[PDB]
Design a protein around this nucleic acid. Sequence first.
RNA 1: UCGCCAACAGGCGG
RNA 2: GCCAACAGGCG
RNA 3: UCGCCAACAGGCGG
RNA 4: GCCAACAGGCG
Lengths: 129, 129, 129, 129, 129, 129
Amino acid sequence: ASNFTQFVLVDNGGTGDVTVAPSNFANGVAEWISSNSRSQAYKVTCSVRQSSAQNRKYTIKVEVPKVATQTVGGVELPVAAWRSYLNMELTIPIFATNSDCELIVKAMQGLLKDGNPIPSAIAANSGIY
Amino acid sequence: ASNFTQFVLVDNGGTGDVTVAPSNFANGVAEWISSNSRSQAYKVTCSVRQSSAQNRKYTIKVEVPKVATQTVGGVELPVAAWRSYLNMELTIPIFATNSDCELIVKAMQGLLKDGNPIPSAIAANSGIY
Amino acid sequence: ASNFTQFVLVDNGGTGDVTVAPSNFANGVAEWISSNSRSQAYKVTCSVRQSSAQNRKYTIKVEVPKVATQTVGGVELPVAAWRSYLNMELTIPIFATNSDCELIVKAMQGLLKDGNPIPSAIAANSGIY
Amino acid sequence: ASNFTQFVLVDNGGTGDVTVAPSNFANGVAEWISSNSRSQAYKVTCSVRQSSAQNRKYTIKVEVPKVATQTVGGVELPVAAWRSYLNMELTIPIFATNSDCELIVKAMQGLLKDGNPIPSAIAANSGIY
Amino acid sequence: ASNFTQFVLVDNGGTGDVTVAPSNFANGVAEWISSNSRSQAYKVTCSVRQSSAQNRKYTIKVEVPKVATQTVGGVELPVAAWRSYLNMELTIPIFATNSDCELIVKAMQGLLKDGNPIPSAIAANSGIY
Amino acid sequence: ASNFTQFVLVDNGGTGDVTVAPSNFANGVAEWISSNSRSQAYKVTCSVRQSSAQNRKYTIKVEVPKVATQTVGGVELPVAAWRSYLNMELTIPIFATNSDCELIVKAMQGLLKDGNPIPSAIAANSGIY
RNA sequence: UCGCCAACAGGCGG
RNA sequence: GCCAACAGGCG
RNA sequence: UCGCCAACAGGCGG
RNA sequence: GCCAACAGGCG
């Protein structure tokens, strides 16, 4: 068994799908990267640790690049015009059972489900109103 | 129009659904809370701000409580045995178009989609392996 | 739900009723006003916040115009001679369930029911005796 | 006449009705309490004073207790788990006629009528939106 | 109802129309923006406050951008060559009835009607004479 | 050209129209007023200047009389209770061509078109909600 | 709260 | 960068 | 007399 | 608690 596999980060239909694959797992930090120029790749990292006697903390990070071609001195390189950075921390007490955790996940999925406040606001360069 | 409405945070079928409703929107921080004892309620907050000249930062927070009844001196109160805390920060450059933002959202949704590494690990009190 | 709708503030039996409607939502503070100049309007505002660790506090304010000998749409000075202000502050411990809160509301309705001491005193420009 | 009479604070349909009765008028503060131990009683107080040279102010307070039986030192005592506090102040100009005042009373009654926004939000442990 | 709706800021006859939509209400400042990158968007904001004891002030702002594509560090980014800023403040006495206010709105509309002096001068890059 | 001519400020459909006419040109500042006492008149002033090296600024001011319960030709005090003031400041970068300026004007007309948020709010003595 | 200026919900002088 | 009782605390 | 907070006819800042 | 070029920086 293994959950350190490749997965679809962005489901753009069934073609423009962005897939990330395991690239490194050093010092307790799992890292996935999309194919082609690392300079223009999507990045995802995840790590867990006992933040305290009663808490376990997950630290997840995602990088979404804006693909672009930089030309300097007639020399063009594939780069990222800029990057959007997602940084989330999830703290779960050691008393949480699997059911409790399943719930926490559902909460996260609902928070970002299509149509809900937060995702709608983000997807539209907007805030809450 | 308004996106500061109530929504389903947890989709437990069509019955045990956890819904959060707008409760307060002070100092640029939108806050939703589930019904009944505030002591045992789910909490969600969201806020946006220009973190820098080129970046806009979203700060989202979710609290998942473990419902329990505390009895002290024969007096019982509805409380939360403990709480799981989710804290995420999303940084998006001002050059991002709506399409760019739609993508970012998709990335977030995919990261937590059922079956993928991160959600599976969390839902099982596990890390990456 | 979605409670921010217009409602009848003063019920005079269908004819001569005073309806108050949404006029503002800045800072999460809900506001309703009658179809009058701001100086002669009926105003209602409401807001909720966690006033402390154990309490939540609702702040309700109402402004009622002096109608006897009033000149509709005119300039009436001094303002203090033509207006009554009601300030309500409801503190509810975070342990209060929905049921508990229903009771609290009832208590408030009972306090002001027609024929009871308080409303009777007020309506008669008197105190208790 | 005399308006210092007992009244039903909480109408539960004849059964489980909370009634408060005159209990004190010391220092010009009219007081009513439910037929309970001073520690578990519902409390209503009211007072009027000529605040300014042209204003009269009514100060009304209501205390809704959450009855419980606590065990202190191995002995059982009737107590209140917590209390909900309603504090309201009403300022009326001396130029207000009785009709002017009836208007105020009506507005307060309408403000809390079943089905209206404010009472709905309170009873639902939520804000207005 | 709810007046926080999207509207057409620039009417170009159905084709090339600039529309702005609600994007934020944080800190009591209603905001609308065009479906663009935050860097090239049209922006409209509005707020009301009780300036004096007898005045209400509306503060409206509109930003008209001159879209362009700049090359920074060999990379192309969506930017605004420059922006035109409209800042307007409207102070209305609390004694103004709704009809009084409609008068104001009409005057503002007439002030900028096609063919009238002011809009003519502005559109011609000239003064009045 | 020669734009300094009279025009209809408030269009009430031919009958009851408010026309404003040239009344002063001192210091290049154009002024228009309705046929009223200066205290009850409709006033409009406009002027342009190079506010900075890159910008030109138009300053438009409008004064609208409170009409409800007004006494034509009478002395109405305090002035602040009977008048509304509109101050507009339009900043236009020196690069703006005539075409650009036409667009800016359109944006201004759209902002105040009948049925849109801003004018609707103002006309109703309300804010955004 | 008045006068200015701006890169525009900000800055300077009153 | 970390911690938390989580719109808060320390480097 | 205005803004807060409370264990609520009391406390803090104006 | 914040910022970022983001498994990093300052209180």
